[PDB]
């Protein structure tokens, strides 16, 4: 698969599209600084999506359906992007690094933390660059199988243009390793499991005395 002018420019645009408080009252403040980073991330993901070709042409309702369920997956991709295999930690916003223990003290439970760190380690072995990251994020956003998506067909057709662009990219990036393109997609499989381990997480917070802030509650709390 040769990369086309049209794919070149699309990829370049995505990469360019990607370019808060202190750190048992200490406990509820630590949680708060962490949820604040997520809130920031949601804003970034919206801004990013708005730039994705095809996205704003979908009905607003469909844009909500897509972001609602992809946000955590994009957050997890962004987590694995800033993983350091030396210190087994996550470097959010230049300065503040976070290990499994820091995550625990930030209010998250072990049964979420370990899968987050396993995924990040496995993802770091692939050594993805920005172009690969942006595309995976885009593919994740445009999944036609999210709950309440109306124009599945359009969402799917859109996803495949990003899937193709990835294929052709990885062909220039890894011309001798034809497995790299499928290995990257196989991470979206793992990403779905992580997405529901995050559901078990959200539900467990309900059971303790820990309320998600407004935006996060809006995307993640099930309200009935």
């Amino acid at each position: 698969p040769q990369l086309s002018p049209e794919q070149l420019g699309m990829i370049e645009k995505l990469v360019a599209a990607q370019q808060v408080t202190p750190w048992r009252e200490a406990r509820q403040q630590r949680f708060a600084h962490f949820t604040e980073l997520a809130i920031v991330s949601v804003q970034e993901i919206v801004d990013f999506a708005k730039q994705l070709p095809g996205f704003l042409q979908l009905s607003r309702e469909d844009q909500i359906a897509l972001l609602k369920t992809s946000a955590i997956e994009v957050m997890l991709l962004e987590t694995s992007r800033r993983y350091n295999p030396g210190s087994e930690s996550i470097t959010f916003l230049k300065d503040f690094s976070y290990n499994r223990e820091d995550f625990a003290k930030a209010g998250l439970q072990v049964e979420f933390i370990n899968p987050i760190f396993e995924f990040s380690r496995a993802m770091n072995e692939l050594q993805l660059n920005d172009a690969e990251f942006a595309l995976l994020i885009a593919i994740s956003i445009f999944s036609a199988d999210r709950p309440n998506v109306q124009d599945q067909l359009q969402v799917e057709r859109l996803q495949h243009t990003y899937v193709e662009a990835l294929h052709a990219y990885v062909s220039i990036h890894h011309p001798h390793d034809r497995l790299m393109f499928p290995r990257m997609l196989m991470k979206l499989v793992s990403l779905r499991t992580l997405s529901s381990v995050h559901s078990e997480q959200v539900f467990a917070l309900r059971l303790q005395d820990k309320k998600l802030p407004p935006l996060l509650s809006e995307i993640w709390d099930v309200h009935e």
């Binding site: 607003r60 359906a65 809006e218």
Partner: peptide
């Protein structure tokens, strides 16, 4: 609709 249930997300999308 989802839109009526996701005000902050909607408002982020409108700016």
């Amino acid at each position: 609709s989802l839109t009526e249930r996701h005000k902050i997300l909607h408002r982020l999308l409108q700016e």
